[PDB]
Every structure is written in structure tokens, then in C-alpha cells.
Symmetry: D2
Subunit: 462 residues, 4 copies
């Protein structure tokens, strides 16, 4: 049920049903940190499949036999399409250059290509993991290329689309609530009015700006290190390989990948990952505010704020009508906190490069991909299971509007400051409304109050 | 005007009204980072005065002339008492060992001692800054000693006393509010009742535990590096000096300072400062929760929660009665956030020692002292200007208790689950109270409702 | 291949081969955040198995039929022993109280117990997930109890044992290297000598203190929230349940669990998790220093420091003799950075409780357990695959000792300061050794140099 | 002595030599947190002077008497020029909206204007602090406007100019060192060659990208909240004021300030400050790497790497020639760590807005300004006192090139892989050079070695 392969240290059993080889088994024996939840993220594995497909096609310019190249391309495609995820057992907590996952990819693609050609698995014949699958590449410039491919795809396919759905849903609710006037809160104290539409428009702007921030943090993610080889000079690769492989990855993905203009900067640091994590950190601050606001605005039903009725997704008991826990707000705010911590992990890793090579690469991309997936998925879930279903408690909102003390300044042009202050003070002392008090004090009629106190006229500059 | 002093780089002008010398002037010209607001914290300077007083007294065992030693002791006392603060211009962003502030201290104590002896300032006669004031000490083991003396004094004189006042004031309010029943909130939704005294008892326990955590993080702050000299071996000091100087510092301060058992650990790392910062970080989490709760519990007067009436310390407008911004809550929660950031700065510094010496020392102690002073002062301010004057809005609390849907389960033993749930659903649909609805439906009488629904019996297990 | 169950929202298909039920399926439909790497950590699931076993036995005091209790206990044991991990599909990013995992546990134990009794899965007969498996418990006080059980077990079984192995290995190497004198480094400049044993003894002290710090952070992890029910009052549990269930968990685990003296503090905050994470943060700073030092001390073979020969665990090429990448140092320092970020996530979550309930519970325990497992596993791997095999490059160390300029001060008592400074300056200018220069200058004989310059005499105070 | 002023709480003594008034004295008595070192940063105060100058000029469109407006403009100019710094005693740890500093600014400008007009200080005549100096403005939209003006000016005048000087100095050294070949280091192990100019070109690219990142984070800093008044609606200001005051601020500063398109987003959150802090956090990661590399590349003189000779700015000892502590590297890396911590403080504040107003404003801008000033000043200091004077130790670099084992692969095309590996293994075993060994083994002549092993041909792809 196992085949025997060999490396410099001796023999190793490789399961017959696995496409990896001796280097991967050796790597698993020495880095047993954290268990299977710590396996390298699937986006990184898929990105390696893209990279190795691109390199094999380019390397036909540089001596690679087309029959071998095309077998590599087909196997690499299977990796990219997520068809071979079960053959990647290595964890994030490995060599800090990512070289062990590079070798895992080279072995898997080599053995699958051998199988496609009808040969013996583990033989390196006719597809050699290093001489063919890693041709023109290095142990040091491959993982950083894969992690930028993976980050860009996750931003474009998961993070930005999830934020776009949330933006659109918040914007629809802003329009739906554009005429519902409620009492503002500053310092959490009652304040002058604004509509729920206006308040929600602030959330819309925050999400729009989050997408702008993330896009602004992408130009240097599109720069690929492939071609820098061991220390950035390109020793032991071919002239034109760096440019051709970036152009091929760009063609395969439809994304504007380019070769990094300075390979020393590209290998010695991952400042672009720090930059992108920073944009996700800002996004997390925006989403914490939006979700915590919606949480409190839905508080109640009777001892809270009670402005919003959130959809009920988990069944309650009949004897507790009106109670709805804001559980999508909880998942989102937990995600927001996680992104902030992940950002510190990325920052510490990014600050700690040494000379020609930053060797915190696996941990840095793990945290970036984690934050991107959590923010995108949480945005979709918060949208579909909370935002689109939010209703305004207009009966309670209108009641509290008429009971507020904050509308009293509408009276000043009609009865003057002292009488308006006396109304407010008396109403506060007695627990009555402004209207009731103004009438009892003899300062106006009910008809006058309705004519002069118009919240619709208190919503902008004049 | 100025006197002329010299170093091996040439001539320096030293103001005649300053006690520092050529080394200190040289240090100011090369490290201007941040401006005067970045000057080394006064607690570090005072701690250096304690240390140099101790070293001078001990060094009489090791050849130091008693007339010279006693002049150093008197000048060092002046530094320790804050009488010579204006003679320390150096910033935090200096050499990472703190040696430049050590030299600043040596020069100031030398020249003030010379003045006490009637001699010529700047002459190093009869008191030499290196040969006498720095005798038996090193450029590398003095600053870490001063920073632990400073941290321990700030914990005992500022941080723990401020937390103690907050603990005691919260406990008094807990007892004051022990009989005031209100509606609990979980997920921010209405929940079963608890007293304000019970809720406040949670805050009391958090502050008690904060003090316990800070004390638990002090044992290794009391360990002093003095005696490790350059690399931790004690080369170029005397047998017994490490122990004697720590005992003298303990006697001078009344605190249980001891010599660090392993001087390599004491110089190469400042793990104790990370540990203490960690306790302040936990404290900051507790204080964020207490201050934000009180902030929201005071929200209103009419569109918030309205359970607490917070003292108004800043004049308000006569036309805005009842409005009180919780400004001490804002100061406290801003401080909490600062402590969390300061903690990451301490962590990064503490993680980055190299071989025999961690050279992030000034930045680490600055953040520790900043956190300790902010937490202590904010605790006093929050206590005196908010907590002690908090009142309960008992009329609004009683009203919202009677209007709650959460008490309905007191009815189950008397009329059964089915009728109870029907009451709650109908009340929620109609906007009425449980009692009004239970009577309208004909399920019970007013007298039965008052006998069966007793919140005082819903406050514990049975 | 599926059975039909029902909840308030309608019917749900449950796989015939799963022990969870309708509530768990509903929970999975609404929280699709992050994928399967985000599943609730296994230590939490196992801890729930302990908690539910304890509660079932205690509840025989409170009316639970012994036949049902014993079926619950046996099923709960299977959960605790990791026999049913495949029946827990929920992710961390769920309701912030952890109630959905509580319900998942109640359903699994109920259905497995039903099977043990020979009944129909999904029927709630004769074991009801809520009425029996959750008897005397709440939706809010169960997850916090499980997360403290899980944290304490992981500290005692994984984190502390891993640190103990590292301590012991570092201490053995310190003794092995106790006579190997090398040149110290301060500010990364050459400094006076110390032995590799002395330098490694600093690392030993850091790891010893890390274990002390972690233990100091455990007393409040042993406090369990069980019995606080919904808001901390214990409404709807029985007198004595809180104490009995903590004593039973203590008996089952052999660890000193107790009931939390203030349940409001226990439910409204998780300051103990922040405290424990803080101890792991300090540990990560210590390990970053130790691992980065060892990394640089092994640098080379010829353009680095070259003091240590690290074991080679991944095969190199024949043409690159002497090159050994310090890959266990890389995994450990990546782990250290991850712990620092996780600590910020825990801190943000811990700071954000609201009124009676902190609803960041799943994210907080996830990060604590992640840091604990990574630190423990990395400590074992770093120990077994690096530290125990470290060798000293004594040939290179001795060569560089004799070429250092740092031994020259040994000459001062014999030939005076000026001649000793002239030797050092001349040797620096000419690239020669101190000995060669001292002889060429005519200041001493070779025999005198060997008699006066004894590094063994430069290793302590005198 | 003192004058007597009043507020609704009673009488306050105001020093006769101060321009602030009763509101400012009242504010000092309730917020003493931290002491004078916590005073509001001068850039915020200057920015308030710009804003009040702009508002006064614009408000002539909205009824403000020109004689009064022009006195306000002149007094506000004095504040903006730093002439009245001593009249601002309030600390950061004040009301979270910054309203108390707004009132401090209003009072100082009122009383200085009154003095310019020959009137009585403290009389509010002819210049009223609220009715004139705060005309058309609000307690809530003034501080956020000042903090964006301050942040933008500090970026343009301090941060970017300091980085530009560092960029240019690093680029000059890159060109100076373009022909100096040394041994690369990956994982800290010896690696294939690269020039010092190539390595420095990586640092240049990082600083260039830092400046690009900071500029990319400025568009939303230029958005001003002025005009949003209390909750963002603009109630109680005039149509056109928001736009007119932003245009005037842009004209006064020469920077492209604009009114914020959504005033709810501008008041309820400070996401732009989080974004800018994020760019400074990335910059800090770049600078940590540059400064730590240079630190280690200068290590020695004989037991380190020894590639760089750093300028010695602090006198050394004549008996310790060649020793130079990299003290600017220490200041710079301490600053980098501080920026990372400051960033977490900004993040926590930015995440914690409530409804219509984020009330963490003073702490957020303090940390942003602190980071910007430290990075700018440290960049200038690191440039002038380290980078520009760096020399290459070419003799030691050439020696270590010739002694390296890494050049051996130049031999493969000439003698084959087998003999090359035998040379490297033998040299490593014996401690000799590749050339000595290749000759002793009889595989080639000295002349062949010099013709075949040319490091200049090992610096790129082929």
C-alpha cells in the first residue's frame, strides 16, 4: 500500500494513493506544528498550479520538450482547479521561504504528469520535479509569486464581490429609509434629527471607501518575484523568463500581473502584503462600526433602542415574542477583531526580513488570505441574512420623536429662547412631551405647535 | 552665557545655567527625533537618582572616598526628588541601551556635587562623572536598572492607588444599588432581571482582578540588572556589588528589589516589561467594558437606555435639559485604547533583542510608564468626576420593568405555559403591558398578577 | 440517505450518518464563513463532552432519571475522547455566545445516547437535547465553561510540556557549552567574552520564566461560569449546581476547577483569556529572541557568525557543503509573530463586552487555543529537530577569540593603558592580532602574552 | 494675578497673562490625565488657527461684521503661526469629540482679537467666542476638520520630506557601491553573490514605495467635516459654508482640501486616519528591515559581518578602536516599533464609533501625528548621521569573497559537477579556499581558476 522513495537521509514510504514524494514526506516528518487546520491555504496551492502551468509553457522557449511541457501544463491545471487538494499535507509552519510547499507542488505535478504519460510514479521519469517542473525557477522566488497570485485572486473573487453585495444592500436600505426621521445620537446622548436613510448612507460610504482602499492596495500585489532566483539577481534563470512568466500568468488569470521592477525588494520584503492587510484592517474598522451600530439599533424589544427589526434566522420560543439576537452582527464583529489581530501578525512578519530574503512568507500570506476570506464571506452572510431583511420600527421611532426634547429649538423663531427653554425644562421635570407642556404653559396652541415644529425642515443647512 | 567643555571630537558650548556636560550636549546634537515632548520620562530620571545614590553609598566598600560619596549622595537625592528635571534634555529616541541618559545623569550629579563642594563646574574635580558617579557600573546595566525602579514605583504610587479608588467607589455604588432591579441585556436584547448592584458587582470584581494581575506581574520587575556590566558576566565590577546595590535600592524605596538571578536574561531581554504591559493590557480590556457600559447606561434622556444619571461637570445649555455627555467615559475608553497600542509597541521591542543586549530599552519603558500613568490618573478622574456621583433613574427603571415582556415566565406555574405565551404575544402585538393584557384576556385578576409576578424572587437559583 | 427533522422555520434534511440534528443544520445554513479550516477547535468540543458528562451525573441530585443520566454520560464520554469529531460542523464565526455549538453538543449527545438505548435518532426520545442534556444549564453559561476547561487542559497537556522539553534541552546544552568562551556582542558590536554556556543560560531562564508566567495566568482560568445561567443570577438553575458541576469537572480532569465567585464578571467578560493570552505573548517575545539568536549564531558557514552547527534535517546538495538553513528557527519565529497577532484579536474581543454578556466568545478561545497549540508544538519541534543536536564550532570560535581586539584590556595591569591602546590601534590598522602586534612593538614577549591574557579570568566580577 | 470669569457652574480664576477663559479653566480641572506631557499636539492647535481664520473670512458672506472678522483673522493667524502655544493647557484625554479644545481655541482667539481692538479681556466684547469665532460651526465638526488639516500638513512638511532625503541618500550609496560584489545571505546562510549597490537598490525601492503608499492614503484625509454640524445634516449652518470653508483652507495651505461628500461618514468614523496610519505602519516595516540590515552589516569589527563602516558620532575609547555602535539604527528601529503600536491604538479608536459621532478623536490624531513626526525626524537623522557617511569595508569584502564556498559553481562548465563538489567538500573540511584546494587536488591551475571564476559574470540571468 506504499511505494519506497529515497532522499539523502534514506528511504521513505509514500502512500500509493498520493502524488507527492520523498521530499514532501520528509517535510511532514519534521514540521508537526498545529495539525491539519494549519495546512497551507488552498488558494496558495491553486496559485502554484497557475504558476507552474505558466512556467512550463514559457520554458518551451528555453529547451523544454513540448511533450513534457504539455503533460506538466495539464497536471498543473488539475492543481489550479482544486482537483488534487488531498495531495498537499504541509502546514504553514514550515521553512520560512515556502520552499517545502514549492517542492510539494513540483512532486505532485511531476507524478500526475508521469501518470498521464503512463509511467511509474516516484520514478521522476519522464517528468522530473526539479529539472522540468521547477525549470528556470528557484527555491526562493516561487512561493512569493504564488502568494501574490493567490492574494490577487482572493481579492477579486471573494473580498471585493462580498463588499460589493453589502454596499448595494446598505444602499437599497438607505433609499428605502430615506423618509424615516429619527433622533440622532452623539456621545450616545439624544441629538438633533436625521433620517435612517442619512445614517445608512454613512455606512454605504464606508463600504464604498473600503473597496477603494483595497483596490489602492493592489498595484504592488500584481508585481511578481518570479525571475529573481536565489537573491534577486536572476542568476541561473534565463533572460526574458521573468517577463514572459508574468505575462503568461496575466493572460491565464485576466489580471494585470507584471514582473517586479526590483527583485531585491520583492524577495527581501513583503511590504505589499503588509499594505493589503492594512487596507483590510481599515475595512474591519468600518465594518465593526456598521455592525455594532445595527446591533444596538435593533436592541430591545422594549429596554433598548428599538429602531430596527432584524430578521430572525434561529428559531425562538413562543413565550419570547419580539426577541431577536443579532447573530450576524456578532459573526461580523468577531471577524473584524480577527482581521485586526491578523494584521499585527502580518506586520511583525513583514518587519523581520534579513538581508536578501524575508523568511516569514507562509505566515504572512496565511493571515492575508484568512482576513480576505473572512471579510468577504462575512459580508455576504451579513448582507443576505441581516441587511436585506432589516425593517424600521416606524411606530416606535415616531413615538420617540414626539417624546424627544430635541425638537424644541424649532420654537425659538416663534416664541423666543426663554419660553422654549422653559418648555424643555418643564417637560423634562414632569415627564411630559414638548407639545403637552407648551400648551399647558399657555405659550401656544396645539395647531401652532403642529405648524411650527416640522422635523422634515430640520434635516439640512438653510 | 556658556562654558567650554570638550570631548575627543572637539569643543562644545555648555550653558552656564545647566549641570550637564559635553557628553550630554553631544548627545542632543545627534538625536533630535520628535522634539521636547519626547524627552525621557521623569520617572526614569528620578529612578536614576535613586540608583546613583545607592551606588555611591555601596562604593565606599570598594574604595570611594566618603567625602566624595556623600556629595554624590546629596546631588543624587536632588535628582531623585525632581529638583533637577530641567537638566535632562535627551529624548527617548536615543541609543537603545540608554547609555546617553546614564551619562546625562552622571554629568549632572558630578557637577551638582562639585558645586556642593565649592569647586568648578565642568572640571570633573573633585567628582568625576565616570570614575566616581559611574564607579563599578557600566554603560549597559544602569538604564535597565533605572527602568525597573521607575516601573515599580509608578505601579505602587500611581497605578494601583488609582485602581483601588475606582474599586472602592464601584463597590459603594454596588451596595447603594443593591435593591434596584432592572432588565438584563444579553446580545443587547432584553433579558431576565438583575439588580444594578449585581451588575456593578461584576465591575468591582474586574477591578479587583486587575489589581491582582498587576501585582502578579511585579515579581520580575523587582529583579535588577545592576552588576551584569557589559554582557552579563560582571567583568569589571566587584564581587558583592550587584547584591549590595539592590539591597540599598530596596531600603531606600521600601520595595522588595533584588538582584536578577541571571544577568544574561536581564540584559538581553526585557520580558518583565512585556509581562507588566500585558497586565495593563488586560486591565485596559476591563476598563473599556466598565466605561462603555456606564456610557450606554447613561444614554438618553429619552432615546437611549436611561438607567443612570451621570454627574454633569461641564456647563450645559438651558434649552437642553437632561442632556449629559459621559465625558469621563470618553477619556477612560481613549486611554484603554492607547494602552492596547502601547502594549504592541512594548511587545515588538521586547521581541527584538540581539545576543547579549536588548537595545529597545528607552521605547519599552516609555510605553510602560505612559500606560501606568494614564490608567492610574484616568481611574482617579473617572472615580471622582463620574462614579461617585452616579445616580439611578429609579422612576424610569421601574416603568421599564413594568413594561417589559421578560417577566412573563413568572406566570407559568400559575396559568401554564400556553396562556403565558399568549399574553406575551398579544402584549407585543398591541403595545400594552403584560398585566393589562393578562386582564383583558380574562386569564387572571390584577390582584393575582401582583401576587404572582414578583421580580425580587427572580434573582437567583432555587 | 437523510432523515427529516423540523424546527420552527420548517423541515430540514439531516444525514443518516450524522448524530447532530435540526438546530445544527439550521446553524450551518446561516453561518457559511471561512470554510472547514474554521471549524470549532477540537479542544472545545472535547471540553463540552467533559462538561455534559459532569452535568448529567450532578443532575441526578435534581430529578434526572439515572438510566437517562448514565446514557448521557457514556455518550458525553465519547465526545470527550474525540470519538465523534465528525459530527461537529459549525465554525468559529457563529453566534457570539457559543450557543450554537452548545446545541450541537446537546443534539449529538442526545442522539448517540438514544442509539445506545436502541431508539430512533432524531426523535428526542428517550433523551431530549434540551430537557435532559442541557438540564440545569443555559444558552449563555455553557460555552464559557467549555472554553476554560479547554484552555486549562491545553496549557497542562500541550503548552507547558512543550516548554518544559525546550527548557531541559537548552539547559543541557548550557552545561555542555559551559567551558566554550566566545566574544560577546552588544549593539551587534564585538564585546567582552562570555561562554556559550552563559549565553544559553539566559535562554534557559527565559523559558523557565515563561512557564512561571503561564502558571501565574491560570488561577482565573480555573473559575467556571456554569451556574450563572442567562445573566449571571442563576435564575432557572438549582442551588448547588454551580459548585457540584465545578467539583465534578475538577474530579474528572484532575485540575483545580472551581465555580467563579462572581458570575456577572464571568459572563460579561473573558479577562482571564486576555490574561492567559498575555502570558503567551510574553512567551512569544522570549522565543523570538532565542530562535533568532540561534539563527544568527548558526549563520555561515563563512560569511556569517559561525558559532553553532545546527542539525541538517532537509537534504542539501553535495556541492554546497556546510550550508544548513535554520528552518526550525523559521517555524518558531513565524509562530511567535502569529501569537502576537492572536493576542491583539483576543484583546479586541475582550474589550468589547456589552452589559451582561460578552459575545466574542468563540473568536477569543479560538485564538487562545491556537497560540497554545502552536507554542507547545513548535517548542517540541525546535527542541527535537534543532536544540538537542546543536554543536559548537569550537575551531572557528577559538580562532576568532585569538583575533579579537576585545581581550586587550587584560594587558593594562602589566604594561599600562597607553601601550595597551597602542597595541589595539596598531592591530586594527594592520589587520594583525593583539599578540603579533604586542611582540612586534616590543612591549612584551610571547610567553608574557600567554601568561597575562587568559580569557578564563575575564568571565566574572573580582 | 487673575481675572474673574464665570460659567453656569460659578466663578473661575483666569490668569491675567493667559488668553483662554472660563470654559478652558473648567476643562483643566476635570481632565488632568497624564500631566503636561499629554497636552494636545501643537499641529492640532495650529490647524485650528487655519480653520478659524478660514471660517471668519467666509462668514462675512453670512452676516459677520468685517471689522470683527478681520480681528479674528489676525488672532487666528497668530495661533496658526505658533505664537500662542502657551495658551493651550488641555490634554489629549478630554472629551472624545475634541469640543473642549475647540472652545479653548475660540476663547484664545476671542481674547487676542479683543486685545487687538483695544477692548477688555474676558468681556466677550466686541468678539464673542461662540457667536463670532465659532459662527456657523459646531462643537462636533470643528475638531475633526482641524485633525485632517494637521495630518495633511505633517505629511507634506515633515514625513514625506524626511523619507525623500532618505530615499536620495540610499540611492547615492547604491550607485557608489554598484561595483562592490559581496556574498548574499538567504536564511542568514551564505548565498550567491550580489553587489552592495543591488542590495541597497532594494532599500531604495522600499522607501520609494513607502512614499507612494503614504500619498495613496491621503485622498480621504483631504476631506473635511466642517459643515456637518451636530450629527452630519448641517442643521444650524448655512448653505455653501461647508464648501466655502474647505476652499478657503485649501487656498491658505496650498493643499487640495475638499468638503467631505458624506458628512455622516466624516463624523461617525475616522477611517481615513486608520488608512494613513496603515501606510505609516507599512513604512515602519520597510524601515525596520533597512535599519536592521545596516545594523548587522556594520557588525564587528572582527566577530560580525563587517561589510560596512558606519560613521561614529559619539566619542569612543582609544583602547577600543574599530568599535562603532549603530546608534541611529537603534533610534530608527525603536521608532518603527512605536509606529506599529500607535497603529493598533488608532485602529481600536477607529473601530469604536457610536451612531452619529466617533468620540475617540483626540487619541486617534495624537497617534497619527506622533507616528508621522517620528518617522520624518528619524529619516532625516538616520540619513544625515548614518547613511550619507557609510563606507564599504572593501578589503574585508574581497577577502570573504575569495574565502567563500559559494563561487564553486563557476567551475562546473569547465571541470564538471563532480570535481566541483569534491573541491567544495575538501575546502570545507580543511578550512582552505576553493582555489587552494582546486590546485592541491590537481583539477586545474591557478591561471585557469582566475579565468573561470569571475564573480562579475554571476550577477544576472543569461
Amino acid at each position: 500500500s506504499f511505494r519506497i522513495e529515497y532522499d539523502t537521509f534514506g528511504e521513505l514510504k509514500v502512500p500509493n494513493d498520493k502524488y507527492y514524494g520523498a521530499q514532501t514526506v520528509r517535510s511532514t516528518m519534521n514540521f508537526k506544528i498545529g495539525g491539519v487546520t494549519e495546512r497551507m491555504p488552498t488558494p496558495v496551492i491553486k496559485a502554484f498550479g497557475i504558476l507552474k502551468r505558466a512556467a512550463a509553457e514559457v520554458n518551451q522557449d528555453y529547451g523544454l520538450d513540448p511533450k513534457i511541457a504539455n503533460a506538466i501544463m495539464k497536471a498543473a491545471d488539475e492543481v489550479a482547479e482544486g482537483k488534487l487538494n488531498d495531495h498537499f499535507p504541509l502546514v504553514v509552519w514550515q521553512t520560512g521561504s515556502g520552499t517545502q510547499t514549492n517542492m510539494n507542488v513540483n512532486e505532485v505535478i511531476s507524478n500526475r504528469a508521469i501518470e498521464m504519460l503512463g509511467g511509474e510514479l516516484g520514478s521522476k521519469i519522464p517528468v522530473h520535479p526539479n529539472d522540468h517542473v521547477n525549470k528556470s525557477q528557484s527555491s526562493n522566488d516561487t512561493f512569493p509569486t504564488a502568494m501574490h497570485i493567490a492574494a490577487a485572486i482572493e481579492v477579486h473573487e471573494v473580498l471585493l464581490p462580498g463588499l460589493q453585495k453589502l454596499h448595494d444592500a446598505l444602499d437599497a436600505k438607505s433609499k428605502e429609509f430615506a423618509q424615516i426621521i429619527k433622533i440622532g445620537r452623539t456621545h450616545t446622548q439624544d441629538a438633533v434629527p436625521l433620517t435612517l436613510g442619512q445614517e445608512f448612507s454613512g455606512y454605504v460610504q464606508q463600504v464604498k471607501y473600503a473597496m477603494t482602499r483595497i483596490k489602492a492596495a493592489m498595484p504592488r500585489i500584481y508585481e511578481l518575484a518570479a525571475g529573481g532566483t536565489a537573491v534577486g539577481t536572476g542568476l541561473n534563470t534565463r533572460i526574458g523568463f521573468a517577463e514572459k512568466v508574468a505575462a503568461k500568468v496575466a493572460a491565464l488569470t485576466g489580471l494585470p500581473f507584471v514582473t517586479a521592477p526590483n527583485k531585491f525588494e520583492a524577495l527581501a520584503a513583503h511590504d505589499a502584503l503588509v499594505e493589503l492587510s492594512g487596507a483590510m484592517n481599515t475595512t474591519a474598522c468600518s465594518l465593526m462600526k456598521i455592525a455594532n451600530d445595527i446591533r444596538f439599533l435593533g436592541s430591545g424589544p422594549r429596554s433598548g433602542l428599538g429602531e430596527l427589526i432584524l430578521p430572525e434566522n434561529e428559531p425562538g420560543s413562543s413565550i419570547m415574542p419580539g426577541k431577536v439576537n443579532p447573530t450576524q452582527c456578532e459573526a461580523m464583529t468577531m471577524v473584524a477583531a480577527q482581521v485586526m489581530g491578523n494584521h499585527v501578525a502580518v506586520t511583525v512578519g513583514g518587519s523581520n526580513g534579513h538581508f536578501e530574503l524575508n523568511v516569514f512568507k507562509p505566515m504572512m500570506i496565511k493571515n492575508v488570505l484568512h482576513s480576505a476570506r473572512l471579510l468577504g464571506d462575512a459580508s455576504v452572510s451579513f448582507t443576505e441574512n441581516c441587511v436585506v431583511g432589516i425593517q424600521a420600527n416606524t411606530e416606535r421611532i415616531n413615538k420617540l420623536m414626539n417624546e424627544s426634547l430635541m425638537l424644541v429649538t424649532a420654537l425659538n423663531p416663534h416664541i423666543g429662547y426663554d419660553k422654549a427653554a422653559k418648555i424643555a425644562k418643564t417637560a423634562h421635570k414632569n415627564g411630559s412631551t414638548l407639545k403637552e407642556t407648551a400648551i399647558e404653559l399657555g405659550y401656544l396652541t396645539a395647531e401652532q405647535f403642529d405648524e411650527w415644529v416640522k422635523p422634515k425642515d430640520m434635516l439640512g443647512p438653510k
